[model samples]
Target: QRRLYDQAKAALAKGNSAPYMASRSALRDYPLEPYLAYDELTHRLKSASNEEVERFLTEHGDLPQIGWLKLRWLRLLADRGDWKTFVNYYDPKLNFTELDCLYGQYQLGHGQKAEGYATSERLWLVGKSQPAACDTLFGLWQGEGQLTEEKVWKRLKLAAEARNYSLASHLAQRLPTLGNQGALMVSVAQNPAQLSQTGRFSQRDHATADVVGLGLRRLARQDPEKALSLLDYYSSALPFSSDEKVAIAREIGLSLAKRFDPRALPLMTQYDPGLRDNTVTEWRTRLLLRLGRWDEAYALTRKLPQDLAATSRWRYWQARSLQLAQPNSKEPIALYQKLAGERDFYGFLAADRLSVPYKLGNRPAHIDPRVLQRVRNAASTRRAMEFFNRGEVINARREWYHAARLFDRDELIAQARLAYDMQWYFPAIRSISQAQYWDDLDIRFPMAHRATLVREAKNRGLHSSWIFAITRQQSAFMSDARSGVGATGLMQLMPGTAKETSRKFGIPLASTQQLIVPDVNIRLGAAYLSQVHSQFNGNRVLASAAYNAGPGRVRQWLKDTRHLAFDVWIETIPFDETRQYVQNVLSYAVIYGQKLNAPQPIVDWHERYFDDF
Candidate 1:
């Protein structure tokens, strides 16, 4: 069956259908027979009968390729101006703008005026420019006198707010009554800092207020201090609404928080005292934590809207602050005890504070035997397993994702178990997570390449579990993983970093391809971690941060800082990614230690306060 399937694929690749058609009967019982049929139908899509396409669509509807095939068919119908057939299969939920515009045009041409106009209006009101196909629809809308000035100004505001100034400028041409104001808006959208001129915003109309609001908020993102000064003047002098005032303050506070500016809290309080925005309140508390103002941090944490205070993150910080502010108080002990029951990054930190055993929360997913058999027998799972066995990992993952979307919770858990048994670690982790079954640590944290990892760890004088945690966090043991920023392989080493680490450690790396080799990546990644670890004076927290955000950025973040507790320093790290990266690696290390039969503390005793380094 396998050989015949391969023969059919080869023939299909050369534009010959005879071999594929012949193998269709002989390969009827094969798990991948549907894939062959899919290829043949897709190859002959231009001439395939509607009956044939519909049959395949209904039979293999679970496959993602089926959706693509439908889209292609719709596009074909649109190209030929077959409005009658296009409407038969058009799906409003597909979310492709070109097809939607084509469909709207078809509706208008077919006398469905209300629905067609509504579709065109929704598509036009978007901030981003629509597809070129939408031009005809918008033309019809304008001809019907449906493009009102209010809608035009609304879209212009959205475009300007989205920073799509080209779209905003194009839209400005439509508002002829407010031509000068529109022109000023275009200029302000380009350079929001020009609002500092003080004479530009002399008018007291809503359009003028729109310009000021947009400009001040945008300027806040670019230069918070300047935005703050301008906002102070505009709020008192302009006829801005109360909600608009809060919205601009929210933007400025968020931008200042992102920069770790100390003025963020005071500004948020002065303008948005209610702190209706969750993110604004969170940043206010984070700034207080960053400054190590324990009393204020505790007070703010206590008064946080119930929802925010209930989160494990805020609960952990509240406890820490209370302990810091009142060393003799036992209130924090209860808080830590409550928080330590959950198994997460903050939960583990809370356990460390209480000197209690960390909660592992290891519960195996209950996989029904019947569900397991059904999942194992499913064509999607069979194709996925076969592709994985053939080393076609991309296709394997695609098929697995298809199955994941279709399966129920029990079936998903069963599929996750099957993937785990096959040593396909990445999909196993993802499948169980999709099922929302979080207790199966064995499957979630598979010990792949254990011998190589332990060997490398011994050679570098590092804990094997730390390597395990890093590898798990880096790529989830996906050997061929590639990050968007060009990091690759199990340890996710960037090309340049891998090359440099190889050279520095006297490890022979022939090419970038070798980074995917489990042994080579483990060796090089471990050596790099070791180098950073030593550079930070054996501080794993600093080493982890350095590994993520580079050693130089970590040093700069540490500059001008007084001694801070380990958790406090991590919470105050300027980069959100590096901060979470450090937290996850540290927490996973403790978990891996338990799994590796070598228990380790979440934070070492000597590494409590980071003062000297």
Candidate 2:
């Protein structure tokens, strides 16, 4: 009997389809344990009708595990819109935890204006006071148009009282069209000179600056001539940090070189040669090539570190430089041939250059049929997520190793990274660990700043797992990671975010150096997260959405709705970015719970606290 039970347990753990059948069979052969029964019922409930779910709950109600089973039944009832039973079975005494948060979201989605806000508020004050609660409130506020300048100002004042200057300044700058008031508020909340002194600047706070910088960078990437127009304005900002200055100079040099400016060559030389070591090395090489210094460009290609040189883009650029230096070069053709055989973004370029037909088969097969089929089925982000859940079913069936190899490494890594962004650390770790290609686990990047993360989380009374999830998603554990738009470091800390973090933490930020340091990056990140938490009154989902889409946008989203449940508001977030971000973060929190050997927290939180709305 013990051996049979052990086998059943293992099967369930494996998450194979057979486990459901085997567990059912085991129950018939042996007096069912409460846990076994709960697992079977929960599995059935995923696709089962409310009637069937209710029957299962009824049959199991007298069991020792009925408390949790009841919550599961309630979720099914809520899903099926069986309001009567949902209300009856809903026990306010149970700690609904994160589930309560979800329920509130669901209520807000359905336009239960007063009830949704009440539930959301209750959850924050009396229940977990989590970040999800704030999101729910924000949703409710948006629906009801309850958020006013006065309300926001009150919140800003509270943030100031707490010494959360980053949030205070951020909110100060978000006062709709009152440019003078907004600017004054920002100045009072965060003195610009003080911020500059600490080398911290708010990128979002200055929309004009952000637009100019972004425009220049984009133009530099394509038409350098256009980029040169904005270089003077960007360069004139003496308030910008050295890192920001370097970035501006880099853009200016690239743009100036296109026009054959005599000064451009010297500027490019003066710029850090180490910049070639970054992910954008190919782009830099292109600039060098355009500058007509074939020898210098060729030497730089040879001098490139092995990792950078091994990339298809690097090799292509090397070949191009060589070809330009020595026309009709066979060496360039040979280099192109080697790259043409691989399946990657660069492989296509290589194949195009070689005048050869590209074959998809040359790429390593990583996608599983199950996951592929699911991806095919998806239309919206929600459907994609449902498919993601189904993919998990396949993942469990394939066991760890096989499942890890079934998806494109970059995609899987991105998904896993986003899971971390959503604060789902265990899932992030699990997904990454499962991948067959992850080589180095020793070197810590800002994305994997474990110790500081836990410390900051504990200090802020936030979940460490959630922070890890967010970090993973933001930069995939790459310390020197830089977004195409110039957001940098593990958390994808925009130059502004990094600078503000420095002031909030009273740290001296000289350049982009702090961003590359995992501890410093995470410290500032945590401080920013704490401020977001305070703004949303500990609603992590709202805070996360705000993190991705900005608090001002979130505020506007709240005002757009009259009254809605948390889920409805989330579903209705105008920006797909915020909506997906909220879901990803919450899902990650749940997955992280599993990774930390606390799967029950997620399950229990989902079931108990949020069984009914």
Candidate 3:
């Protein structure tokens, strides 16, 4: 069996198409090794009979291998433009995250471009969520000419003019070019000081940039102080690059310092300059003396610029420093008041020294227990289990909020896993949140699989998150979870795939019963995943699609419309079932990674292969 496995692996490496056919034949003798079965299935998917793929799935539908294969089968269906079938297979009671994806797909299918954009934006903004569908929809919108440079620039300029700096900054960075007139308008509208700040702009044909430049020039001549008011406008903006933020902070710091105001300290903290300016150092030294740190104050004033050394502020500190050196004199009240009045950024510090009340606004009221209890009771264990069972039915569609309200804390989490399995994500998130009330819920639910699954996935060089996502989607992490459709164990492997896997691995599988074991199911499932990953050349999207719909269907989909953009191709997959299945699987992959505390998988595969292809 080992010799056969080695031979099959070597044949797979040869880059020829015959390995798949050959591997399938080789695996017939040894039945339970899932890795070999996966290789054969992948090869068959690439270029084999649809009947072969269908038969493989049917025979192995209940095995752990079926989970991944089902995903491929769904993708194949999507590629074929089979929408009705796709919808039939889709689970509607998804979590918020999954619902967001489904909504994106629905928008794409219906050609509701503006609504899609708004939905994507809302998901990012209101939900603070990241779904692959968001990126896909954004890409579609960009392709449709809705996200043009002119549009972005106009929006950004308007925002800055309105003193909504955060939105302005966000738009500016996303725009194609910063040298445009609209870009300059953003800067000028944000900061009045930029009106006169020279060398920031060069000759640009755009009239908006010129208008900004003129404003800066006029402000520079009439009232430098008034122009400085805009500096505050610029400093408060968000989403600025680190470099841009630092430059703005430095300018604000200098402007405030010249006014001898203590408010400049916060701005200074933004840049953290190693050495203070001469006048600032002199004034600070004086303030220190008045506060009675005599030795330090003397040393600071000694380094001040000569012209400032004799000023009233400087002299006051000098006398105070001397008083501090003497050690018994009461600090003069007059000095304290004068220093307080002169406080700029340091005014609060001075106030703190004098033990003044630095009051903030009132605190928020506590949540009402009645409301909390209602939320807590909304999702009870029995109700969640009912939803979970209903969710498994192909024809039944569950409402997200209703399902969310069905389970109590612990069961809510378990139901969340079930929701995730069914691609009902909004409820999944709601349930997870509800589950947080119980300390032992996580242990009972244990969404995070133990080292067994992780190690198995790792051996295949597959992300554990992806495996976990697939597992959750397939069986809700139930070791004994069996599908009426014949999927068995943790990953829902079917008999044929298990038999083939057992044969390839030289594991003695007297019957299909051995495949139901958690360890056995995981090992075979991981191996099968690795095979699909290789066939798709590391394209998880494609591989996931292949897993659901079959490689032949995927190949046909790819060949049918080779010219369409990836986002469009994904949206327009002929088999609605596969299209949605692929979307759900990939979306779940992202959500699982996040929930499991894993770093986000870089979405570089599309760019690497499909971008130009």
Candidate 4:
């Protein structure tokens, strides 16, 4: 039976449909019979009769491939102008934009003017350009006099705000009444610095204010001081709204805070007196902390919005601020003791502060037998397992995701456990996370490639758990994982870094493709980690930062650093990604250390204070 199934698939691929048709009757009970069915229908879709397509859809409704097939069938029906059948089969809930445009156009042609025009207006007013199918519907609406100049200007402002200058420029043409000022909106979006040439903006209407606002917001990202000056320059003539003024100030304040500029707090308070935005409130506290105004930072922490104050980040920071301001007070120690019982980056830091044990909180999910059986019996699960067994990882994951969308929390946890049993660490972690079952540490933090990781760690004279943590953070144990920056494999090694490490360490890596091999990737990653560790004077904190943000950046951050507490220094790191990366790796190291039965401190004792840097 299996051989017949295999033969049918091969014949179909080779366009020898006779054998596949002959074998279909024999493989009725086969696990992957639906796969052949989908392949045949997809191959013959253009030529297939509507009745034959509908029969296939009805029979295979439970299969994951059905959605893809249905979409293709709908588009083909649309191409043939079978409007009656198209309306019958169309599923508005699917929300594909091309189909939406076609459906809206169909309604307009079929005498549903108000509904059709409403849909067209809704679709046309979006910030980005719509699909080509929308053009006809939009033309119908515009010909009916629904596309007013006011609507065109609204879309232009939205397009500019979305930074789609090309779309904004297209919308600008509709506003001929505004003359060149309409074109000037696109210019301001393209170069926010143009706001400094105050004479360029000749109008005082809201349209001109919109351009000024967009430029000030964009400009604030690069030059907060200059953006602030321009905001003042245009304020009186442009009639900027109170809300717009506050928003502009918030952007400028955030930019200043990011640069560690002294003017951040004053500008934030001057415009947004209430400091209503949590981001501004948090950054205000961060600025105070960076300036060593411990009491003021502590005071700000008390008045933080309820949600922000409740987080482990602010909780830890509040305790830290009080401890710095009044070292003899017992309040900070109490807070640290309470927080140390939790498991997180901040919690681990609290644990280190109190010299207490870090909490792992590893509780396995209770698998329900009924839910497990249901997940096992699912057709998508069967197809996924079959595809996985055949080493077709992509097909398996696609089916797995389709199944996940329909799963409840218990079913998802059961599915995750099944994935874990197959040693597919990435999907196991993903499913468990989707179920929000954070305490399933055994499955979430799998020890995949343990022998290789341990060997590499020993060879590099690094902590085994730290290596595990780095691999976990980099790719969550996805062996074929790839980053947008071209980093690949379990350790997410960039090609340049892998090649240099391979050469320096005498490892044979003939091609970058070898970076996806677990053994080779681990070897090169551990070597690179060791190199960074040595470059940072054996400081894992600095080394981890360097690993994420480059060694040169860590060197730059260390300049003029004196008498700064380690936690304070970490809090003030310029890059949000690198700051979080360092914290996660360190905390993960502690968890992995516990799992490996080799306990490690969250940070070295000397790292508590940073004067030595």
- Residue-level lDDT of model 1, residues 472-576, one tens digit each, is 888988888888988999889888888877778556887887668888788888889899989988889999988888999888777667677888888877677
Candidate 2 residues lying further than 4 Å off, grouped into runs, are 1-170, 173-240, 250-265, 276-280, 328-337, 344-613
Tell how far residue 530 is off in model 2, in angstroms: 55
Query: How does residue 80 of candidate 1 score in lDDT?
Result: 83
Clashes of each: 0, 42, 78, 0
Q: Write the per-residue lDDT of candidate 2 for residues 1-613, one digit (tens) a residue.
A: 5424545656666464465465665555343344465675566666776677667666655443456667666666666766666665666666765446556655676767678777754543321124554565566655677666655555554554345657666666866854454444445334322222222333334433432343344446555554454455445552444565566567667555433354665556566556552523433455455446676677778877788778765676677668768886688898888888764435644675676855334123244556545423322223224334545333222232233344566545444444444443444556655554343222111234566787878876778777876786676665667777777877778787677777776477778754677776776777788888788766675778778777787675555233233433443354546665665565555445444544412212221111012
Expressed as tens digits, the lDDT of each residue in 241-288 for candidate 4 is 888888898899998887777788888878766657988888888878
RMSD of 1: 2.8
Cα lDDT listed for each candidate: 0.85, 0.56, 0.52, 0.84
TM-scores for all predictions: 0.91, 0.30, 0.31, 0.92
Residue 543 displacement (Å), model 1: 1.9
Error of 2 at 399 (Å): 18
RMSD of each: 2.8, 25.8, 24.9, 2.6
Candidate 3 per-residue lDDT, tens place, 1-613, comes to 5434555556665445365455666555343334455555665574655577667655554333344554555555555655555455444343345445555656767777777777655443431324554566556666766676766665564566456767666766786665455556655665545544434443434544433433433443334355446444433332334554444445445444433345555455445443345533533442343233467665665555667654544444444454557556555344444444331212222333344532212222233455444534443333343335544322122333444544455445555555555544435544565766322223223454557877887797887678876676666655555567665777777666667766765456566765666677777777777877887787776777776666777776665333443433453354656765665555455545555677433243452235225
lDDT of 1 at 175: 91
Give the 10-residue window scoring lowest on summed lDDT in candidate 2. Answer: 603-612
